[model samples]
Target: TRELQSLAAAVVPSAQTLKITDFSFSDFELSDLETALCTIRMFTDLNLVQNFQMKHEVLCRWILSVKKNYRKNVAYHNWRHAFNTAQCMFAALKAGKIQNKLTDLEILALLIAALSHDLDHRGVNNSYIQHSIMEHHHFDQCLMILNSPGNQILSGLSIEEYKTTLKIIKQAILATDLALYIKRRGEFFELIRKNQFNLEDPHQKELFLAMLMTACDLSAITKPWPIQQRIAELVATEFFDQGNKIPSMQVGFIDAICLQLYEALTHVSEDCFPLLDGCRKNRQKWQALAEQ
Candidate 1:
């Protein structure tokens, strides 16, 4: 434990908070763990969320540390992936200019949810877990880590606040299962078509929050072509490692899930249109790669 702490500490600041700024997709694979922590903390600060229970730095360090310890050093679904997903959430909040549209608590939930969505992921999809009799095991692992005494990043919150935050976190993390996204997308689009998608409604917000998590998880499709290609290769490698077929599902995945989700998000926030457009081009490139 001491060795792990020192390894993590060596990458972080010795004196004060590390500075973070606007993030780019390219920076995702390039930034190390400490840089990722800096960005998450900076994002939390930007929300101006009050700290009543624990020091921000301490909480941030502990959360990042716990998350790091949980994430296995796989080809793609590692800390870098977590950081990238959180960066997408950060970009959506900042670049989309939807900060005020959400309450401080909602914003808090979104950021924290993004940061911890894939906790203890075993580089495999939910199907394998279910078939292997490990249903909800990853999520249970996440809760175990969060509830651990040394990893109480949420310790400072009031009982009500803590309960609410934990509830949102659990729901949001579990919603990252792409299996859920297909069902969620249909329901979300139906709400939008009926003009009944109320962001202010608690139930409606829960559904939208899940959609947003999926969008951020699949945000790589909207990145630059090089980054998109790189992620695709990495994803393929990870899938192959799990004894799954290679490149067979890539095109269908984007067409059915990613493009559809981004298009719907464009309706929610016009800022997402660029992402949709990027998705269109990426689909063509990926198709070409598949043919070749």
Candidate 2:
């Protein structure tokens, strides 16, 4: 297909390592083609393709297909946001050294979940849908896209591998629900406090990746000033188009959700301190403005 050819053509470019750098993780600039390229590179860099023996063509099909699934009528919840989420996951796993704590299976599922978390969002938050209805919808839509033709990138895996990957993907996507986070994060913190988190335990493993999903979902708060400002503007536009002072909301968000979750996460994998540090610095800025 011509799409495959263009995806191949996507590789024809300079080193351009510096271009992908943005505080909110590739929000300011990045063409769809470039995102696809970076995605392929992420898989390669993680040695996912080599380890999983993923087919390049199937991967490209899935990437391009997934890109099309995002509706642009919505501003903040569109494809770029998903791409940003995946990029942050890539950064944390690679730069933050959390990869050592997970299996290649977990890494692959997490990356896919990030890219597909908000698939087909309609610019409406969960409350707008009357509850976590939208989160449930997003998860459903995620499955639809994956099982649809051409998007069956999981075909490369055995049936058992396929089932476990889908299960993780489901849990990761659902974990984006903030209420679920507020309800369950206490358990994660308790695990950290008690030094009781064991990946060997199925429940603990689910909680860890679930928390990681929330961490990456809310990562914009951890971005630098300019980047954080732009993303905040997007949230504001979406919310207005769809309450309180932006600064107050942000500070409350940091206090309520981001603070302890990330702190415990850092205890689990200190390399991801980039997220925690970014968060704390941004909190100081928000705190100053909120007090003003």
Candidate 3:
């Protein structure tokens, strides 16, 4: 991107290519400008900008606006977590080679959804009350930002292009809700089991993207030990602040969610095996701790 190159000179190392591939690069190390820079890199790398014809300046403004909305004081679900989730998707798409299977619009919507999925998160899960409590709130908040002045990055696309992208974006954001993931995960796993999963089918396509959101949302659990441990601590602290008892639930979390989601991904791309491997290693540590 011409815009990306200009901004890269301002605060970024210009060596942006080298760091993101490792799957262990910590988002904690990024300064605010670098976080925005990396996100732009992902958009450009994934061809979301070119394919959708989103104006370069418009895209930049939208990213800054989205980042601005994340409550800075929120422990786990703030801008950093959103940025990391997107980075995980970028790596998941690139390293797993899953990007090849997706339409450009699919790639466009997924990364935007990744970046905006947890907009305005208040450091609470859905359990505080009601149906999709925080999920719908965040979903509304995401659309709210997108519709705001000067942040209408998708405004330039054609009628169907705009509609489909935003529709997928809404679905992707809502699908981050764990309950929804559980509800839909069974048939998705069955598709893979029967060698019937293909993105060409609309049902399979949407299902794959939904699972991708959960996988990317939980991607922190698949990071190397150092990165994984710190994120887990932050997550536990965030939940603790909600008056929730964890009871070494990391073991339960891995067994119940992360393993199957990521293991299934390995079938999607053998190159994705490291995500499962890292998750398993972390689960071992969590299992060992559960005994104490």
TM-score of each: 0.82, 0.91, 0.90
lDDT of 1 by residue, 34-107 (tens): 55455545454554335444554555555566457544546677666767777777767767665657766677
Per-candidate local distance difference test: 0.67, 0.81, 0.81
- Between the candidate structures 1 and 2, which one is better when assessed by lDDT? 2
Query: Of the pair 1 and 3, which is ahead by lDDT?
Result: 3
Q: Alpha-carbon error at 50 in model 1, in Å? A: 3.4
Worst 10 residues of 3 by lDDT: 7-16
Model 3 lDDT at residue 22: 58
Q: By descending TM-score, how would the candidates be arranged?
A: 2, 3, 1
> Candidate 2's error at 191, in angstroms?
1.6
TM-score of 1: 0.82
Question: Over the stretch 154-266, how does candidate 2's per-residue lDDT look in tens digits?
Answer: 77789998899988898899899888898898888887788778988988989999999999898888988888878888988888865149988888889888988778878
Worst 10 residues of 2 by lDDT: 14-23
- Which stretches of model 1 miss by more than 4 angstroms? 1-24, 28-31, 48-53, 125-135, 242-248
Quote the lDDT for 230 in model 2: 82
